RNA sequence: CGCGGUAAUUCCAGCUCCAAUAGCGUAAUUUAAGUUGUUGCAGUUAAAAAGCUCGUAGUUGGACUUUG
């Protein structure tokens with residue numbers, strides 16, 4: 043039944059790491075009374091490790107879009123329970139989204155704006171900094187040719203994200219390929 | 230543009246000198262003309278903003294969708 047917590051696209055076989063994440067997810071469903079009720083409906087569809095720095099790993103778990111709103115209500119508590127099981131790792135939930143390529147020249151086919159690459163990358167960035175809310179964005183175009191984005195986070199949720207700023211920057215570059223640094227505006 | 234009204238560098242002549250030269254002078258059009266201006270002109274007082282507003286055609290129209 044631990045494989046009923048994973049629905050990989052195309053009914054593909056979960057890898058050796060997804061089963062560990064799924065198996066760890068099943069345990070919290072029954073062991074933790076607080077999360078008993080909520081975790082029943084929730085399920086994931088992928089999971090991967092990303093190296094951050096200093097032999098540190100980050101568990102990036104993708105979630106069905108329809109369930110992206112249910113995880114938020116139990117995001118703060120669930121991450122605490124999964125991080126202890128996955129010692130020395132940070133858990134990040136990102137809803138799955140499709141990126142439809144722009145139509146060719148003179149094509150009648152339409153494309154919803156949410157399926158655009160820019161709209162998806164911005165949406166991934168918002169799901170990456172949960173529970174922190176973005177309050178500003180800056181993009182600096184360096185003379186050499188590279189560009190770096192600076193994201194301002196609400197200082198209210200600073201205790202739950204101050205230690206993850208390195209994981210956010212590393213996780214976002216692999217999913218988007220863009221440099222990002224997070225900062226808290228003075229208040 | 231001006232010269233000539235009794236001491237004319239300007240007219241009529243001689244001399245001398247100058248330019249082009251087997252050629253040179255005189256009587257539509259291009260250049261000069263950014264004096265027709267697309268490149269590229271003007272409109273306070275020199276020529277030139279309609280007394281004022283609406284308004285169709287015309288002309289002109291913010292940003293955003295695949296990057297790395």
Ligand SMILES: [K+]
Pocket residue numbers: 269
């Ligand atoms: K010119």
Ligand SMILES: [Mg+2]
Pocket residue numbers: none
């Ligand atoms: Mg005489």
Ligand SMILES: [Mg+2]
Pocket residue numbers: 239
């Ligand atoms: Mg003369």
Ligand SMILES: [Mg+2]
Pocket residue numbers: 264
């Ligand atoms: Mg004229």
Ligand SMILES: [Mg+2]
Pocket residue numbers: 270271
């Ligand atoms: Mg003029």
Ligand SMILES: [Mg+2]
Pocket residue numbers: none
């Ligand atoms: Mg007058």
Ligand SMILES: [Mg+2]
Pocket residue numbers: none
């Ligand atoms: Mg006048």
Ligand SMILES: [Mg+2]
Pocket residue numbers: none
């Ligand atoms: Mg436009």
